[PDB]
């Protein structure tokens, strides 16, 4: 079992009617804790989770450091959008997008399991740091322009020094300082709904509300046979208060409800749950 510190940048151009916008968000596991948006007046990095309200006392330079970092990042991806547009020989008329996702997965004893740093252009793979943290994979010919530059500058080493050092150390700081928010596993509150459609056909919907972390499995079974191919399974959605919701539904013959069981697996439960419908 591991925890993650992940950052997500998006930069995108407004060709005519604006300079590019740049947004950055950081997550520990499924919890957002920081943001930056270049559109604000004098834009600053800002806290988004409660323990981040105490970082200023624990690290008095944190906000200034990271604000300066984010503002340099916005400036270089604004040039980066023009460089890449030229690699693809694209015109200046249309809008384009650069995305970056980087961070570390860390197992129990502060042990790095994986580092990553990936970029996308207009929503497709552009260049990624390889698992060995010493080489880059370029997605196409245009991206080779970038790989060659980053190889000659030796950026992989700087990325690897961050992912093995700062990324791991700061995950641990946020995990400890944010223990109340981060190191919990709230189990879902579950129940089954019943809304018939015809005289002899019924929908059974298995709900799971307020759980954290986001990972969860809901399964419907008939007489112990799995109904995965037949179920309607909605995408997990945020409830707005830092937790998540999900349901799974199955259409079933009327009068035959009690032969269907909903299986629920979540980290916050002692044991997976089976669930029947009951009047």
């Amino acid at each position: 079992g591991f925890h993650s510190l992940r950052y997500f940048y998006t930069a995108w151009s407004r060709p005519g009617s604006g300079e590019p916008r740049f947004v950055a968000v950081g997550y520990v596991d499924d919890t957002q804790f920081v943001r930056f948006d270049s559109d604000n007046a004098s834009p600053r990095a800002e806290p988004r989770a409660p323990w981040m309200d105490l970082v200023e006392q624990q690290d008095p330079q944190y906000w200034d450091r990271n604000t300066r970092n984010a503002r340099d990042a916005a400036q270089t991806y604004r040039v980066g959008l023009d460089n890449v547009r030229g690699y693809y020989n694209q015109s200046e008329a249309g809008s384009h997008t650069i995305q970056r996702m980087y961070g570390c997965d860390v197992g129990p004893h502060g042990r790095l399991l994986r580092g990553y740093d990936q970029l996308a252009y207009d929503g497709a793979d552009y260049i990624a740091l390889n698992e060995d943290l010493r080489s880059w994979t370029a997605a196409d010919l245009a991206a080779q322009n970038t790989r060659r530059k980053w190889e000659e500058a030796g950026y992989a080493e700087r990325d690897r020094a961050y992912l093995e050092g700062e990324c791991v150390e700061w995950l641990l700081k946020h995990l400890e300082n944010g223990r109340e928010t981060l190191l919990r596993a709230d189990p879902p509150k579950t129940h089954i709904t019943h809304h018939p459609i015809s005289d002899r056909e019924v929908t059974l919907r298995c709900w799971a509300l307020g759980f954290y972390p986001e990972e969860i499995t809901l399964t419907w079974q008939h007489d112990g046979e799995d109904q995965t191919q037949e179920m309607e399974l909605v995408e997990t959605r945020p409830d707005g208060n830092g937790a998540f919701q999900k349901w799974a539904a199955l259409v079933v013959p009327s009068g035959e409800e009690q032969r269907y069981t909903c299986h629920v697996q979540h980290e916050g439960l002692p044991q997976p749950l089976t669930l029947r419908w009951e009047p």
Binding site: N69, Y77, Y155, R158, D159
Partner: peptide, 8 residues
């Protein structure tokens, strides 16, 4: 902290 950012 944020990492460094490299120019594509």
């Amino acid at each position: 902290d944020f990492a460094n950012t490299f120019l594509p």
